[PDB]
Design a binder for this molecule. Structure first.
Ligand SMILES: Nc1ncnc2c1ncn2[C@H]1C[C@H](O)[C@@H](COP(=O)(O)OP(=O)(O)OP(=O)(O)O)O1
Ligand SMILES: [Mg+2]
Ligand SMILES: [Mg+2]
Lengths: 552, 392
DNA sequence: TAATTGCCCCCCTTCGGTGCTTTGCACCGAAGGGGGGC
């Protein structure tokens, strides 16, 4: 099998091996499993067992990417529950945008990757399984795994560590060769001539074979484009492997989920992909088979995404001697796109940000969140942060980050004048407005009858109390502020006893998940000067205690 | 020393955060050198534990230093000179390297596992575990205490006026001597440590709560003052408003000038006198934990309160970079956190739990780029805006 | 009810836990679905 040292694995303390019965299998699956198991037994990958082993775990088979070949899987869920914890060494997924341009490239795959790594001997008894006989009568043949099984939660980490150990000497001897390893997939890039590169590839294959890792010629790619990790790699550009969007007349919940996932995958290189209207169709749904009609907003978004996907796009390879630039654009409804490039119109990567964090937000906070997401992704892919081009004025960002109560920062960035600019839609006055009317607003609600009232008693004698149903105290305070905004002129001073409403409004939101806050925002945008003042509620401050009984 | 976890504890299982290319290269070089001399050893995935790692470039030092976030391990591990705060000059010395001489208990080594990431995930992360006492773990000083006392005994007896305290990896050595004499003593201590194998706590002023002074008060001004006094009522029992509240009677314009009555002026003077005196009845309980709240006041100004119970502050201060360009808010907050932690270690010997006025994602993205210390205080993030700036 | 597997990254939605003062509301992490990888 391999001279690789096994990784010592143990069960969780006090646990025993699984004893799960084999479920019935179809004749095609049984024949495929019989053939695979016979070949594995001949090579010593599995061993026949008898009555001395009391464990069992169901087996089954699926089709591989290359059809006419079967992958044998074991439903090790019980054993996985009773297996010790592992720490995963795979910390992420390599991206072609992080690849540097190489003169010669080769993609290798090892055949029967897991089955070439031996399994810990003391653990082998727990991997017992039974191949059922064709039809019935004669009992199935019982085996145990001598190698890493597919379906066991310890197999991926063990294989990845073993492959790293195997590749360490070759990488030490050849520091000028770039080797990306993802499980058993090896991208090998070099600046050597094609003949020298192929000699190095043969040396690497011999090195792997010395460890029992065969590299069949079927999975050995020698000419571009290279199919690597879902991408097609050309000498000077990379694309995603073709994305086929489903074409359905009636859409179910599962179909919408699949479409949204495929669009999210496509958004890494196709600019302008939007999924917000399609994702909104998944809110409140219960059954995955329930048919969701499109809402004429998801239809427009789907048409736009299809139009975007019509034209083939490509990314370029990283040039470490140049600068990373990330351009951000707003799209509306909390959606943003971004392009990471080093030369103009030559995108390394593309992406979107549409997370709705928080009940109330503005454009500046969302832009900061998008910048943070781009920064962390760029640190992952290229190990450095890019220079940003944001549709926000330097003055606007200065005002926001100097007046905001939280610490906020954006790395080295430059303003770009793209028409949908980012701005704060209203500003709260730092001092009270002379000559303007002053409202003392108040709102109360009993937490038993779910009813309350709200008013805006004015210094000039004006007053109005409105009753409110099914509302809480916070809703009554927000409604009182809304009342003050409604019946005031272009300039108004407002005094309230609600630090919740103050906390909401002082953040300067422009969108909210509450319609009351949205109406308040509309009124605030309509006004010219607004000053908001807080006051301790039951402390005799006149106005907010002069007539809060009006609403209490 | 056979260390053990706290009863019923499992072990750290914290994921590694992504690192920049320079940090990863520095970590790879440092860990290769460490593995060459046996300080760390490569491990596999059958070890289920993990702590995050990164690298820092210390103050005006061109050498990268590896830093391990052992906060979970420190919380899970089962393992102070009152005159140091009154000293004149305190110098902090890094004595972490010494910890690399004493081996670590075998059964505990698995808890010190960490993973070096890769740029663009080119390879699976490389796992290591410590064979010797690691820097940043709270058990390392508790194990090296005997050797530290043995090394420092020839110095403390020769210099009885110098107060030396040890926290994690840092020796805070303080003296009441001249700054040149202090530097000479520091050089002596260095030489002594090598052969045996710039704070100023006197200027740590508190930040009191000051009421505003004005020759003419408006309804808005009196309202803000009454709110401030109502908030201070939880901190200074016996503070009063009454007459100031009586001034705010009826509905009046916020810009209306309202004269101060005799009772109101007298009570305002009394309130100012009460605020001037420090709060009485606060004592540092070593059993409870320290909580440090930070508020951003603008113009490069920050305020903070270290307390063990709410509304009973043990220290109030104001960190200030005074702008000086420095548009980086995260750098300012990181420097404030480091200074507050150093003050808390000097005064009480315990790092405080920080309530950072920042979004979590921004902090985890950018804090490592400005960190200069070898310790990491535990912190949580507050998502509630302060009502009115009452420490300004 | 079927088909039954494992690890990794991502997005989007839902739900329970936590905190703070305002037992309602905001925020966050885990888990469900999906995409991609092997
Ligand atoms: N669907 C899956 N379920 C479980 N493990 C999987 C799955 N796909 C891949 N793996 C694991 C086990 C494989 O040995 C390893 C490498 O993947 P892969 O190249 O597809 O197969 P393989 O090495 O077994 O066979 P071969 O290359 O000969 O077709 O990744
Ligand atoms: Mg393979
Ligand atoms: Mg493969």
């Amino acid at each position: 099998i391999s001279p690789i040292e096994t990784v010592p694995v143990k069960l969780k303390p006090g646990m025993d091996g699984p004893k799960v019965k084999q479920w019935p299998l179809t004749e095609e699956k049984i024949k495929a499993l019989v053939e695979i198991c016979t070949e594995m037994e001949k090579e010593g990958k599995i061993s026949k067992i008898g009555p001395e082993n009391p464990y069992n775990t169901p087996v089954f088979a699926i089709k591989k990417k290359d059809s006419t070949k079967w992958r044998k899987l074991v439903d090790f869920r019980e054993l996985n529950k009773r297996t010790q914890d592992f720490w995963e060494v795979q910390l992420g997924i390599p991206h072609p945008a992080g690849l540097k341009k190489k003169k010669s490239v080769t993609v290798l795959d090892v055949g029967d990757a897991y089955f070439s790594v031996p399994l810990d001997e003391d653990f082998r008894k727990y991997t017992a399984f039974t191949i059922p006989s064709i039809n019935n009568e004669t009992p199935g043949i019982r085996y145990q795994y001598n190698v890493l099984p597919q379906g066991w939660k310890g197999s991926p980490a063990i294989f990845q560590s073993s492959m790293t150990k195997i590749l360490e000497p070759f990488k030490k001897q050849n520091p000028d060769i770039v080797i990306y390893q993802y499980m058993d997939d090896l991208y090998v890039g070099s600046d050597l001539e094609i003949g020298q590169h192929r000699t190095k590839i043969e040396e690497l294959r011999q090195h792997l074979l010395r460890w029992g890792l065969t590299t069949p010629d079927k999975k050995h790619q020698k000419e571009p484009p290279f199919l690597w990790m879902g991408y097609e790699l050309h000498p000077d550009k990379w694309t995603v492997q073709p994305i086929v969007l489903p074409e359905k007349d009636s859409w179910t919940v599962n179909d919408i989920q699949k479409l949204v996932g495929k669009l999210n995958w496509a958004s890494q290189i196709y600019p302008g992909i939007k999924v917000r209207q399609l994702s909104k169709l998944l809110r409140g749904t219960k059954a995955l088979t329930e048919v969701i009609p499109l809402t004429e907003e998801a239809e427009l978004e789907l048409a736009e995404n299809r139009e975007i996907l019509k034209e083939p796009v490509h990314g370029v390879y990283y040039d470490p001697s140049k600068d990373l630039i990330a351009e951000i654009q707003k799209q509306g409804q909390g959606q943003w796109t971004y392009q990471i490039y080093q030369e103009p119109f030559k995108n390394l990567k593309t992406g979107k940000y549409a997370r709705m964090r928080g009940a109330h937000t503005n454009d500046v906070k969302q832009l900061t969140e998008a910048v943070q997401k781009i920064t962390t992704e760029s640190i992952v892919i290229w190990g450095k942060t890019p220079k940003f081009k944001l549709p926000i004025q330097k003055e606007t960002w200065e005002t926001w980050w100097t007046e905001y109560w939280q610490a906020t920062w954006i790395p080295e960035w430059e303003f770009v004048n793209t028409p949908p600019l980012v701005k704060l839609w209203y500003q709260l006055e730092k001092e009270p407005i002379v000559g303007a009317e002053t409202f003392y607003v108040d709102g109360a609600a009993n937490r038993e009858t779910k009813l309350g009232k709200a008013g805006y008693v004015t210094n000039k004698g004006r007053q109005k109390v409105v009753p409110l149903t099914n509302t809480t105290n916070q809703k009554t305070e927000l409604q009182a502020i809304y009342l003050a905004l409604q019946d005031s002129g272009l300039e108004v001073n407002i005094v309230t006893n609600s630090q919740y409403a103050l906390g909401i409004i002082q953040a300067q939101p422009d969108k909210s998940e509450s319609e009351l806050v949205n109406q308040i925002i509309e009124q605030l945008i309509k006004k010219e000067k607004v000053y908001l003042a807080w006051v301790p509620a039951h402390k005799g401050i006149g106005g907010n205690e002069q007539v809060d009984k009006l609403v209490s | 020393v056979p260390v053990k976890l706290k009863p019923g504890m499992d072990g750290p299982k914290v994921k590694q955060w992504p690192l920049t290319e320079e940090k990863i290269k520095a970590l790879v070089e440092i860990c290769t050198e460490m593995e060459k001399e046996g300080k760390i050893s490569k491990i596999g995935p059958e070890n289920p534990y993990n702590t995050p790692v990164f690298a820092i470039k210390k103050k005006d030092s061109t050498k990268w230093r590896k830093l391990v976030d052992f906060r979970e391990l420190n919380k899970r591990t089962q393992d102070h000179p009152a005159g140091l705060k009154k000293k004149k000059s305190v110098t902090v010395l890094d004595v972490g390297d010494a910890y690399f001489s004493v081996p670590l208990d075998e059964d505990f080594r698995k808890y010190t596992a960490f993973t070096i990431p890769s740029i663009n995930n080119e390879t699976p992360g490389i796992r290591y575990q410590y064979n010797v006492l690691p820097q940043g773990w709270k058990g390392s000083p508790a194990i090296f205490q005997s050797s530290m006392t043995k090394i420092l005994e020839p110095f403390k007896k020769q210099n009885p006026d110098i107060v030396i305290y040890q926290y994690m990896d840092d020796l805070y050595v303080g003296s009441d001597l001249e700054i040149g004499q202090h530097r000479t003593k520091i050089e002596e201590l260095r030489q002594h440590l090598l052969r045996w194998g710039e704070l100023h706590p006197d200027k740590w002023t508190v930040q009191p709560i000051v009421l505003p002074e004005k020759d003419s008060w408006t309804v808005n001004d009196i309202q803000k003052l009454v709110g401030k006094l109502n908030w201070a009522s939880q901190i200074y029992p016996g503070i009063k408003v009454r007459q100031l509240c009586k001034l705010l009677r009826g509905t009046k314009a916020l810009t209306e000038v309202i004269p101060l009555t005799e009772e109101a002026e007298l009570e305002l003077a009394e309130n100012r006198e009460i605020l001037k005196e420090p709060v009485h009845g606060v004592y540092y309980d070593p059993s409870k934990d320290l909580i440090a709240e930070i508020q951003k006041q603008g113009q490069g100004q920050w305020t903070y309160q270290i307390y063990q119970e709410p509304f009973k502050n043990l220290k109030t201060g104001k960190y200030a970079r005074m702008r000086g360009a420095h548009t980086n808010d995260v750098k300012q907050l990181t420097e404030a956190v480091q200074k507050i932690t150093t003050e808390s270690i000097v005064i009480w010997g315990k790092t405080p739990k920080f309530k950072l006025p920042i979004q979590k994602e921004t902090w985890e993205t950018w804090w490592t780029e400005y960190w200069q210390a070898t310790w990491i205080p535990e912190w949580e993030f507050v998502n509630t805006p302060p009502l009115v700036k009452l420490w300004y």
